Design an enzyme around this catalytic site. Structure first.
Site, PDB file in Angstrom:
ATOM      1  N   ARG A 261      10.113  42.411 -11.414  1.00  0.00           N
ATOM      2  CA  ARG A 261       9.135  43.269 -10.759  1.00  0.00           C
ATOM      3  C   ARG A 261       8.624  42.630  -9.477  1.00  0.00           C
ATOM      4  O   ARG A 261       8.503  43.296  -8.444  1.00  0.00           O
ATOM      5  CB  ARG A 261       7.973  43.574 -11.705  1.00  0.00           C
ATOM      6  CG  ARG A 261       8.361  44.350 -12.949  1.00  0.00           C
ATOM      7  CD  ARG A 261       7.239  45.274 -13.388  1.00  0.00           C
ATOM      8  NE  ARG A 261       6.887  46.206 -12.325  1.00  0.00           N
ATOM      9  CZ  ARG A 261       5.999  47.183 -12.445  1.00  0.00           C
ATOM     10  NH1 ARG A 261       5.377  47.416 -13.590  1.00  0.00           N
ATOM     11  NH2 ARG A 261       5.724  47.942 -11.389  1.00  0.00           N
TER      12      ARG A 261
ATOM     13  N   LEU B 116      -0.579  53.891 -13.147  1.00  0.00           N
ATOM     14  CA  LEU B 116       0.634  53.091 -13.122  1.00  0.00           C
ATOM     15  C   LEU B 116       1.510  53.498 -11.935  1.00  0.00           C
ATOM     16  O   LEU B 116       1.387  54.592 -11.381  1.00  0.00           O
ATOM     17  CB  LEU B 116       1.386  53.230 -14.446  1.00  0.00           C
ATOM     18  CG  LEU B 116       1.830  54.605 -14.951  1.00  0.00           C
ATOM     19  CD1 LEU B 116       3.194  54.986 -14.391  1.00  0.00           C
ATOM     20  CD2 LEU B 116       1.852  54.626 -16.472  1.00  0.00           C
ATOM     21  N   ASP B 117       2.403  52.589 -11.536  1.00  0.00           N
ATOM     22  CA  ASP B 117       3.189  52.783 -10.328  1.00  0.00           C
ATOM     23  C   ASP B 117       4.551  53.397 -10.648  1.00  0.00           C
ATOM     24  O   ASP B 117       4.863  53.741 -11.790  1.00  0.00           O
ATOM     25  CB  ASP B 117       3.357  51.462  -9.584  1.00  0.00           C
ATOM     26  CG  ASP B 117       4.526  50.655 -10.090  1.00  0.00           C
ATOM     27  OD1 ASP B 117       4.569  50.353 -11.299  1.00  0.00           O
ATOM     28  OD2 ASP B 117       5.422  50.347  -9.282  1.00  0.00           O
ATOM     29  N   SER B 118       5.378  53.548  -9.610  1.00  0.00           N
ATOM     30  CA  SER B 118       6.689  54.169  -9.785  1.00  0.00           C
ATOM     31  C   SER B 118       7.570  53.349 -10.716  1.00  0.00           C
ATOM     32  O   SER B 118       8.193  53.890 -11.635  1.00  0.00           O
ATOM     33  CB  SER B 118       7.365  54.359  -8.423  1.00  0.00           C
ATOM     34  OG  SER B 118       7.390  53.150  -7.692  1.00  0.00           O
TER      35      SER B 118
ATOM     36  N   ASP C  10       6.535  51.330 -12.937  1.00  0.00           N
ATOM     37  CA  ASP C  10       5.920  51.527 -14.244  1.00  0.00           C
ATOM     38  C   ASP C  10       6.463  52.776 -14.926  1.00  0.00           C
ATOM     39  O   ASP C  10       6.833  52.749 -16.103  1.00  0.00           O
ATOM     40  CB  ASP C  10       4.402  51.614 -14.093  1.00  0.00           C
ATOM     41  CG  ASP C  10       3.690  50.346 -14.522  1.00  0.00           C
ATOM     42  OD1 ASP C  10       4.001  49.263 -13.984  1.00  0.00           O
ATOM     43  OD2 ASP C  10       2.804  50.440 -15.391  1.00  0.00           O
TER      44      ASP C  10
END
Ligand SMILES: CCCCCCCCCCCCCC(=O)SCCNC(=O)CCNC(=O)[C@@H](O)C(C)(C)COP(=O)(O)O
Ligand code: SF4
Lengths: 318, 84, 98, 112, 185, 175, 52, 156, 100
Positions: free
Chosen positions: D48, B39-41, B43
């Protein structure tokens, strides 16, 4: 035949309200260098018919969605009480002769505020609820002075019976006796009827339409009819109370003409006032009543109690 | 109502399971988010928000960025809630 | 006793029962207080008018004078309760116990 | 070079994280207040996407300026300054899909 | 087809939308006493298509050359029993569900009273017959996907369609939302 | 039917009391109180109490409950609670009407009903007196004697109203 | 020193009454109503959205 | 047919009522509001014709878009139009409201109010003289007079 | 029976108009149109009540003027009026008359 008399009181009063609308429009126009409605019919006599028909054919919007029972009762109560308050008035013989017709009219006026109270609440809006609250305060604030001034002047009548006012003022108008009370009472009528400069309730310049902002087509028409009927009735009460008229028992027509003319003069005065002055600020309205008027009314009430005793002019009870 | 460390771990694991982007199978107390879970930042930011929602205490940014291990989340929650 | 007395006494009993059984709102209970006062006014007025107790025809008026005083006190308390709790709900008057 | 709010890329990233947090928690309130028909997840996905649009930026001052703009938009959405139309403008619902393959572009028009 | 051999005769199912006559009909059935439901709607599977989907389908059929001389059929994304659909309608509207089934003879007097009205028999009885009929499944005819448009699920678009019928009943009591209707698929 | 106008009015009075006693939202409660006040005025007028009954119409309906309404409006509730809103409210409302009907029927059927007191089913017109009051309204003179005889009552009531103003100010101070 | 002598389990959880006063809740009595004065308003000159 | 005659007379009555009592709403964005007020001024007073300015959109029957309609103001204009009960008529006053006028190419101007709300009568001018506005209002009245709602209902 | 008749007739007429204005024009075919702060100044309303009480106490005065003990009647009437004035003055000076 009593039902015939009821209809004779009701329908002409409604027609008078309808044409009072046109009269108001034309008078305001002429005091503003304009001409009132004149296209619709000769000299604009058919304008109220057009207005009513347009209102009725108009869409019946209703986003109230809360206590629709109340949202319907409020116009009913307003119109019914406006019509009823006319009943005890002696012109010169009253439809219903009450020993206490005056207190009856005071109670009916107090009740009529519930029409504005409920309409604004059941509308369940912002301006409607707050505007309705401002209404309650306005009518409630001036109801006090209205009662005191009325009691002070009737101290000379000797009863709350409206019919005896004609006998009491047989020789002179009671305005000569109680003109300060007359001025305060006239302003009080203006406040109670929610008319300019006290048109805070509706208050179009400040509140889009006030308590009737969510009322359209027929219910708005009933509120308008109730308002104007109250105006005419309050001016008639003023005329009977202060500007008494000669009554020949054999020819009531003379008194009826004189009374009608005086009431018309007072209604034209109402329209004239609406045209001239700007609107009092909600705060200033209450300041003028509780802090400025209420005192003077108390002093004049003491004086009007004392005067019959010290002048041996106690009026007969019967 | 003793606020056990294993109960905090259970709540943390349940929160992580609810997050769709984390695959339930490879989720572990020692599975670092960025590498193990991928998962990303942002996330990680979302999952920290979910954690602070679940335990009711606000996690500041500097403490939040020191996370990215579920065990680190559990021990940080224990520190802030004074467990053991 | 004629049936009207029965009806008015029944009205007072009903209003009393309503006052003694709150549901949520204090205003409803204050409404029951004002209602009981109305029952008492009507009963007293009927008694005094029927018996021609001329000098007691003012007793109903004094009763109402103090009825409105009590109502005013009730509203003056209700506003403060609402300010302290946000509602007029009876369940918020719970700090004092036993 | 004078820093707007951050002297380094890391500090700008911290500010971005804060802004994202605030938008994320604001989204359900936006859906409820504006009576939007989208789901909370849909709105957050749009958030997002919008945040990733500016991801390629590699200058701290640009990041700070974007953060300022994001904060202003968030203040508008938190208040009712923006209408439902303004909020839904992010979702290009009315606009028809614009195909991106060469052959479709060649068919449709002369545009490059 | 006789006059225009190559005409594209589209065959849509029940269509729902902001100004729908199908969903809104059920929403307004609450006004009509209770909720009249022939067989409690247990024999009427429905497959409603969204209005925007239908319109775009028509447009694409106009644009696409292959659409000529093809009897397209527009079917909804999911199939629901009449009871399920009406329940979901009353849920999103948050209106009290009063489903009383309609015995033919017992409610025939109600239908006769509706017909007895000197004006139209309350939108005729044929509308009630339509309610008393499940959607035909005609897979041979091409559908929305053939034109490329994908039918939007009712559940997503139901909120928009029936929020107008949403009243203080849901405005004052936000509570939460409701659950998707039962899919008979 | 005009023989038992007082009884019809008393029944309406009891119904309004059940209405505001079941505790719907104070709006409907206010409606029930207003109806009951008007009906009580009707009964009082029938018994010869024009002034007294009219007092309720003004200082009770347009007075105590006119502010009761103004109050509820300030403390607006989310939903207007009605009799049907709560099963208990509707049930109590129906039971209250039923209770009245039971006593009413018993009083009429059983010449002498005895709930807690003894009541005779004869019309209220029976109890009225055959005397003449002459050129007077007995209610009016009795009420006006408050200034000639009831000076002590006047003192106490005026003092109570002044202390009521002070008390309301102090209670609404709120520190 | 307990809130009540012979405290039951439920009462045991309850804290003793405060020394002087009760801590007031967070507001929940009044706020500033937000009004869009215009633009349609007669006094707003037609193009003024005065958020008051 | 007798039914057609009754329907025609009733439609005449309702059309006369609606056109005689036209209540425009107090809606003026830009300069053309000044000429609108001058129409309300004594020289060309609109009240003679039954035209009365009423603030409430719910109590109003005609919307006069007097002024430049900006992109920021457009949603509010649509909202006020929607809250207005029917029958409702829209009169566009000024080149700015008709098609954008001087600011047609402005980024912040809606190029005509027809894009946002349907328009019945377009009054040219910049500003349209108050006489031109009164002429447009009378043309709207004639348009109402020509309406055949009840006739179309009877023909179905 | 006359007053009852008048009340009935007026109420029925007004309600009839409300019917012809809520339902009769509602038939006309159309389409879909979509669609508090704690007032502490309510103290004014409460003061109205206690002043309305004095209003009620003062209404018997016209018949009170018919007594033989006019001295006592006048003293008590002025007593009530002076107490009302004192109440108003107290509320005025203590800034209790903080209208709006
Ligand atoms: C309805 C929903 C509306 C959505 C509206 C949300 C907004 O307003 S988007 C504005 C946010 N803009 C930014 O955060 C600019 C960030 N600029 C950057 O360069 C960052 O991507 C960084 C610094 C590279 C960090 O990227 P990561 O978050 O680590 O990857
Ligand atoms: S048309 Fe001319 S007068 Fe009218 S708003 Fe535009 S610029 Fe102003």
């Amino acid at each position: 035949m009593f039902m015939i008399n009821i209809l004779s009181l009701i329908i002409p009063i409604l027609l008078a309200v309808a044409f009072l609308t046109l009269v108001e429009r034309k008078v305001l126009g002429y005091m503003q260098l304009r001409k009132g409605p004149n296209v619709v019919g000769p000299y604009g006599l058919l304008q109220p018919i057009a207005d009513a028909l347009k209102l009725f054919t108009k869409e019946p919007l209703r986003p109230a969605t809360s206590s629709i029972s109340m949202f319907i009762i409020a116009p009913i109560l307003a119109l019914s009480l406006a019509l009823t308050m006319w009943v005890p008035l002696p012109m010169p013989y009253p439809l219903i002769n009450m020993n206490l017709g005056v207190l009856f009219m005071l109670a009916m006026s107090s009740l009529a505020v519930y029409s504005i109270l409920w309409s604004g609440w059941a509308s369940n809006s912002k301006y409607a609820l707050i505007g309705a609250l401002r209404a309650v305060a306005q009518t409630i604030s001036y109801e006090v002075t209205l009662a005191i001034i009325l009691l002070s002047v009737l101290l000379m009548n000797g009863s709350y019976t409206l019919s005896t006012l004609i006998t009491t003022q047989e020789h002179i108008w009671m305005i000569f006796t109680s003109w300060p009370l007359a001025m305060m009472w006239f302003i009080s009528t203006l406040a109670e009827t929610n008319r300019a400069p006290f048109d805070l309730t509706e208050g179009e310049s400040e509140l889009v339409s006030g308590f009737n902002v969510e009322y359209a087509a027929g219910p708005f028409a009933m509120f308008f009819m109730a308002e104007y009927a109250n105006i005419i009735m309050m001016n008639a009460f003023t005329a009977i109370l202060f500007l008494g008229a000669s009554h020949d028992p054999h020819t009531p027509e003379l008194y009826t003409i004189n009374f009608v003319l005086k009431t018309l003069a007072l209604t034209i005065t109402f329209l004239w006032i609406r045209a001239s002055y700007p609107r009092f600020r909600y705060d200033q309205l209450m300041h003028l009543l509780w802090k400025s008027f209420l005192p003077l009314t108390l002093a004049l009430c003491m004086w009007h109690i004392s005067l019959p005793i010290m002048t041996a002019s106690i009026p007969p009870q019967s | 109502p003793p606020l056990t460390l294993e109960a905090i771990k259970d709540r943390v694991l349940y929160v992580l399971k609810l997050y769709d982007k984390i695959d339930p199978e490879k989720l572990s107390v020692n599975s670092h988010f960025m590498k193990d879970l991928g998962l990303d930042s942002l996330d990680q930011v979302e999952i920290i928000m979910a954690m602070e929602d679940e335990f009711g205490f606000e996690i500041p940014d500097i403490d939040a960025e020191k996370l990215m291990c579920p065990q680190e989340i559990v021990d940080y929650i224990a520190d802030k809630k004074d467990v053991y | 006793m004629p049936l009207v007395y029965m009806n008015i006494i029944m009205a007072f009993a009903i209003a009393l029962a309503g006052l003694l059984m709150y549901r949520s709102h204090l205003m409803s209970s204050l409404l029951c207080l004002e209602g009981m006062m109305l029952s008492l006014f009507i009963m007293s007025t009927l008694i005094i008018l029927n018996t021609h107790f001329t000098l007691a025809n003012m007793m109903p008026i004094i009763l109402l004078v103090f009825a409105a005083c009590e109502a005013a006190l009730g509203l003056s308390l209700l506003v403060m309760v609402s300010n302290t709790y946000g509602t007029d709900y009876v369940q918020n008057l719970n700090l004092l116990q036993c | 070079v004078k820093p707007i709010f951050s002297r380094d890329m890391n500090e700008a990233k911290r500010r971005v994280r804060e802004l994202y947090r605030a938008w994320y928690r604001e989204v359900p309130n936006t859906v409820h207040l504006f009576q939007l028909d989208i789901s909370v997840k849909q709105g957050r996905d749009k958030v997002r996407e919008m945040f990733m649009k500016n991801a390629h930026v590699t200058d701290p001052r640009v990041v700070d300026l974007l953060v300022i703009k994001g904060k202003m938009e968030l203040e508008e959405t938190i208040n009712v300054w923006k209408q439902r139309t303004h909020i839904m403008r992010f979702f290009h619902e009315t606009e028809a899909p614009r195909p991106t393959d060469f052959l479709s572009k060649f068919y449709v028009g002369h545009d490059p | 087809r006789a006059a225009f051999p190559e005409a594209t005769i589209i065959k849509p199912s029940d269509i729902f939308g902001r100004e729908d006559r199908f969903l809104n009909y059920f929403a307004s059935m609450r006004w009509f006493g209770g909720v009249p439901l022939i067989s409690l709607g247990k024999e009427t599977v429905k497959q409603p298509v969204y209005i925007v989907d239908v319109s775009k389908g028509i447009i694409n059929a106009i644009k696409d050359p292959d659409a000529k001389g093809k009897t397209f059929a527009f079917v909804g994304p999911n199939r629901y029993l009449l009871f399920d659909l009406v329940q979901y309608i009353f849920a999103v509207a948050y209106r009290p569900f009063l489903p009383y089934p309609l015995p033919h003879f017992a409610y025939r007097w109600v239908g006769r009273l509706f017909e007895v009205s000197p004006f139209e028999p309350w939108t005729t009885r044929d509308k009630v017959e339509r309610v008393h009929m499940s959607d035909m499944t005609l897979p041979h005819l091409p559908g929305l996907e053939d034109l490329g448009i994908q039918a939007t699920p009712l559940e997503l678009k139901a909120i928009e369609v029936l929020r107008r019928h949403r009243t203080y009943r849901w405005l004052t009591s936000e509570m939460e939302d409701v659950k998707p209707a039962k899919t008979v698929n | 039917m005009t023989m038992y106008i007082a009884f019809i009015l008393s029944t309406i009075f009891v119904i309004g009391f059940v209405g505001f006693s079941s505790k719907p939202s104070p709006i409907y409660g206010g409606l029930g109180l207003i109806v009951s006040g008007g009906v009580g005025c009707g009964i009082v007028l029938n018994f010869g109490g024009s002034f007294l009954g009219l007092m309720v119409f003004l200082i009770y309906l347009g007075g105590m409950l006119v502010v009761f309404g103004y109050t509820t409006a300030m403390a607006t509730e989310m939903y207007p609670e009605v009799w049907v809103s709560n099963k208990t409210v509707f049930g109590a409302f129906v039971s209250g009407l039923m209770m009245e009907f039971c006593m009413v029927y018993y009083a009429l059927k059983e010449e002498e009903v005895e709930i807690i007191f003894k009541f005779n089913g004869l019309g209220d017109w029976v109890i009225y007196d055959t005397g003449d009051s002459g050129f007077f309204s007995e209610e009016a003179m009795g009420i006006a004697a408050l200034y000639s005889y009831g000076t002590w009552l006047v003192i106490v009531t005026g003092w109570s109203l002044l202390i009521g103003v002070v008390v309301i100010m102090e209670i609404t101070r709120g520190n | 020193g307990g809130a009540v002598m012979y405290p039951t389990k439920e009462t045991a959880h309850w804290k003793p009454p405060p020394w002087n006063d009760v801590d007031p809740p967070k507001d929940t009595l009044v706020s500033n109503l937000t009004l869009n004065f215009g633009p349609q308003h007669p006094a707003a000159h037609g193009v003024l959205r005065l958020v008051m | 047919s007798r039914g057609e005659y009754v329907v025609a007379k009733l439609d005449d009555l309702v059309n006369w009522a609606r056109r005689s009592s036209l209540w425009p709403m107090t809606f003026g964005l830009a300069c053309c509001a000044v000429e609108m007020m001058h129409m309300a001024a004594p020289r060309y007073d609109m009240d003679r014709f039954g035209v009365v300015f009423r603030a409430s959109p719910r109590q109003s029957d005609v919307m006069i878009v007097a002024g430049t309609l900006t992109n920021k103001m457009a949603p509010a204009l649509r909202k006020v139009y929607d809250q207005m009960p029917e029958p409702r008529y829209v009169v566009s006053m000024g080149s700015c409201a008709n098609g954008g006028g001087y600011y047609h190419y402005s980024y912040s101007v809606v190029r005509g109010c027809d894009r946002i709300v349907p328009v019945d009568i377009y009054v040219p001018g910049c500003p349209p003289t108050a006489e031109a506005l009164l002429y447009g209002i009378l043309q709207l009245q004639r348009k109402i007079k020509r309406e055949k709602r009840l006739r179309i209902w009877y023909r179905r | 029976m006359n007053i009852m008749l008048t009340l009935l007739t007026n109420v029925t007429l007004a309600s009839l108009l409300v019917l012809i204005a809520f339902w009769l024009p509602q038939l006309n075919a159309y389409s879909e149109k979509t669609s508090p702060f704690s007032m502490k100044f309510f103290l004014v309303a409460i003061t109205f009540l206690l002043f309305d009480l004095e209003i009620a106490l003062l209404l018997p005065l016209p018949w009170a003027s018919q007594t033989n003990n006019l001295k006592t009647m006048l003293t008590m009437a002025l007593f009530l009026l002076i107490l009302l004035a004192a109440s108003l003055a107290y509320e005025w000076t203590q800034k209790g008359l903080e209208w709006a």
